[PDB]
Design an enzyme around this catalytic site. Structure first.
Site, PDB file in Angstrom:
ATOM      1  CD  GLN A  19     -60.728   8.381 -55.071  1.00 36.93           C
ATOM      2  OE1 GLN A  19     -60.382   8.402 -56.253  1.00 36.93           O
ATOM      3  NE2 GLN A  19     -61.472   9.342 -54.520  1.00 36.93           N
ATOM      4  CB  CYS A  25     -59.985  12.119 -56.331  1.00 37.79           C
ATOM      5  SG  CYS A  25     -61.371  13.254 -56.088  1.00 37.79           S
ATOM      6  CG  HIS A 162     -61.950  11.953 -60.285  1.00 35.64           C
ATOM      7  ND1 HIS A 162     -61.788  11.605 -58.960  1.00 35.64           N
ATOM      8  CD2 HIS A 162     -61.319  10.994 -61.007  1.00 35.64           C
ATOM      9  CE1 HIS A 162     -61.078  10.493 -58.887  1.00 35.64           C
ATOM     10  NE2 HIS A 162     -60.781  10.100 -60.115  1.00 35.64           N
ATOM     11  CG  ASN A 182     -58.689   7.229 -61.587  1.00 36.51           C
ATOM     12  OD1 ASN A 182     -58.644   7.975 -60.613  1.00 36.51           O
ATOM     13  ND2 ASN A 182     -59.823   6.941 -62.214  1.00 36.51           N
TER      14      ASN A 182
HETATM   15  N1  LIG Z   1     -62.830  15.532 -55.786  1.00 33.80           N
HETATM   16  C1  LIG Z   1     -62.721  16.944 -55.649  1.00 33.80           C
HETATM   17  O1  LIG Z   1     -62.834  17.446 -54.546  1.00 33.80           O
HETATM   18  C2  LIG Z   1     -62.450  17.820 -56.865  1.00 33.80           C
HETATM   19  C3  LIG Z   1     -61.357  17.573 -57.788  1.00 33.80           C
HETATM   20  C4  LIG Z   1     -61.263  18.493 -58.850  1.00 33.80           C
HETATM   21  S1  LIG Z   1     -62.515  19.580 -58.626  1.00 33.80           S
HETATM   22  C5  LIG Z   1     -63.218  18.961 -57.226  1.00 33.80           C
HETATM   23  N2  LIG Z   1     -64.352  19.536 -56.566  1.00 33.80           N
HETATM   24  C6  LIG Z   1     -64.164  20.347 -55.405  1.00 33.80           C
HETATM   25  O2  LIG Z   1     -63.055  20.549 -54.956  1.00 33.80           O
HETATM   26  C7  LIG Z   1     -65.313  21.008 -54.689  1.00 33.80           C
HETATM   27  S2  LIG Z   1     -64.756  22.655 -54.325  1.00 33.80           S
HETATM   28  C8  LIG Z   1     -64.473  23.544 -55.848  1.00 33.80           C
HETATM   29  N3  LIG Z   1     -64.066  24.834 -55.977  1.00 33.80           N
HETATM   30  C9  LIG Z   1     -63.970  25.130 -57.300  1.00 33.80           C
HETATM   31  N4  LIG Z   1     -64.316  24.029 -57.973  1.00 33.80           N
HETATM   32  N5  LIG Z   1     -64.620  23.071 -57.095  1.00 33.80           N
END
Ligand SMILES: NC(=O)c1ccsc1NC(=O)CSc1ncn[nH]1
Length: 215
Positions: A19, A25, A162, A182
């Protein structure tokens, strides 16, 4: 449900990707999931495009992050179920800058029709996985930066940050584990993979598991 499942052995999983310097991710998690589902529906194993998501999916936030569920919803509702090949829409955000969306002449590498969410339950996730293939999951990866091998048993399990891919598990081992793909090159972890203990919600692995459905 079998004692152990490893979809890599069935040739259902693409090579590990990078990435790079991007919070993409969530796109690698989602795309990796679709790649495997497409293969298991009886089509060749194909590299598909994370870049399609980082650039074109307005519901998520490109290099700043996103959700695999949002990505799956975007693919079906905004992009006609279309997922491009990596070959015709290559990854270009390794340095942190996402190109703008292009929509002419790209090659459809897979077509999906929807997606399902799984319960917050490791045994039920394993049952689905053993039958239907690798599952996109969110983890707490804050304690992952130093990992070099072994089955992780004291993973920081506090907040999801993640997206990764569950490709299998082993319930027969001394310490049962998940097998996780990963997107941090093959130099990280065990040839780009990590094993975390199964049954204790390591890294909050059960909290946000879902999968694309092929059509
Ligand atoms: N790396 C990522 O973007 C990721 C990957 C898994 S979680 C997460 N975090 C978000 O997407 C921020 S927005 C959100 N809305 C509800 N939870 N998180």
């Amino acid at each position: 449900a079998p004692a152990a499942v490893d979809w890599r052995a069935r040739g259902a999983v693409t090579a590990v990707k990078d990435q790079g310097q991007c919070g993409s991710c969530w796109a690698f998690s989602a795309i990796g999931n679709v790649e495997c589902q497409w293969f298991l529906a009886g089509h060749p194993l194909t590299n598909l495009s994370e870049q399609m998501l980082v650039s074109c999916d307005k519901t998520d936030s490109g290099c700043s992050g996103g959700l695999m569920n949002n990505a799956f919803e975007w693919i079906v509702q905004e992009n006609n179920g279309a997922v491009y090949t990596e070959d015709s829409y290559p990854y270009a955000s390794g340095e942190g800058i996402s190109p703008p969306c292009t929509t002419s002449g790209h090659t459809v590498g897979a077509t999906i029709t929807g997606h399902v969410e799984l319960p917050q339950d490791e045994a039920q996730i394993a049952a689905w996985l053993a039958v239907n293939g690798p599952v996109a999951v969110a983890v707490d990866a804050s304690s992952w930066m130093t990992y070099t091998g072994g089955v992780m048993t004291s993973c920081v399990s506090e907040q999801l940050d993640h997206g990764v891919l569950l490709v299998g598990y082993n319930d027969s081992a001394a310490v049962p584990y998940w097998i996780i793909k990963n997107s941090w090159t093959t130099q990280w972890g065990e040839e780009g993979y990590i094993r975390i203990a199964k049954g204790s919600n390591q890294c909050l692995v059960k909290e946000e598991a879902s999968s694309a459905v092929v059509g």
